[PDB]
Amino acid sequence: EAKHCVRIETKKRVAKKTKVEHRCTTNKLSEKHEGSFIQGAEKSISL
């Protein structure tokens, strides 16, 4: 999980002006690596 979430606000007065913004960018990632490998051999020799 990764998050970048930011809130900015500003008022200025002289007349008045204001700005307010919120951004929140986010990622989530998952990986699953399941695996199997079975092997075998049999010799038989009879006389």
């Binding site: 075998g40 051999a41 049999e42 010799k43 038989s44 020799i45 009879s46 006389l47």
Partner: protein, 50 residues
């Protein structure tokens, strides 16, 4: 490949050459001239599982 009959394997020559097969539990008549004929058994097995 084995081809056709070249030798007469059954010329008994007037002999009564009995052999007991032991295996097969029977008596057989050999030809008079065969140098040998014998019935001991061998077995070979090979498995390769992979």
């Amino acid at each position: 490949q084995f081809r056709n009959r070249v030798i007469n394997t059954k010329s008994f020559g007037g002999q009564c050459r009995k052999v007991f097969s032991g295996d097969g539990k029977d008596f057989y008549r050999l030809s008079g001239n065969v140098l040998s004929y014998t019935f001991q058994v061998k077995i070979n097995n090979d498995f390769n599982y992979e």
